[PDB]
Design a protein around this ligand. Structure first.
Ligand SMILES: Cc1cn([C@H]2C[C@H](OP(=O)(O)O)[C@@H](COP(=O)(O)O)O2)c(=O)[nH]c1=O
Ligand SMILES: [Ca+2]
Length: 129
């Protein structure tokens, strides 16, 4: 996989963010995770966590996996990095997302993410509390 440049346009919620990629506005959905909706428990905390990570970053990057790059809603599917730290992984590690929606061929970082979920669950963090 390859990291590509993007700039933040706007935080949306725990697992979606609007970025400019190749010069075009796009909503990205984070691969292989699921945050609670804003209206649900830990939804507000997940939203705030992602927002802080992407707004504070000097460099946002997008990393597509080997499979589909857009979902059926037109959202980009990627792993998102803030100053070199993967947002997807950071959310899982903090118990603010679950590993989820792991489709064959967009699953490169599955086992990294599952390792983070295990440590979050061992710590009883947030969703796992
Ligand atoms: C993360 C991800 C979601 N999706 C689709 C599956 C779900 O379809 P449904 O809308 O039919 O449930 C939806 C879950 O995203 P959200 O958790 O943002 O709602 O997006 C993909 O198709 N590929 C993906 O990689
Ligand atoms: Ca969600």
């Amino acid at each position: 996989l390859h990291k590509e440049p993007a700039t933040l346009i706007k935080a949306i919620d725990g697992d979606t963010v609007k970025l400019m990629y190749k010069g075009q506005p796009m909503t990205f959905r984070l691969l292989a995770v699921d945050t609670p909706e804003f209206n649900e428990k830990y939804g507000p905390e997940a939203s705030a966590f992602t927002k802080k990570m992407v707004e504070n970053a000097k460099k946002i990057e997008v990393e597509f996996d080997k499979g589909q790059r857009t979902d059926k809603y037109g959202r980009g599917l990627a792993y998102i990095y803030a100053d070199g730290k993967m947002v997807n992984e950071a959310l899982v590690r903090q118990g603010l997302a679950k590993v989820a929606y792991v489709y064959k061929g967009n699953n490169t970082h599955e086992q990294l993410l599952r390792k983070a979920e295990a440590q979050a669950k061992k710590e009883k963090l947030n969703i796992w509390s």
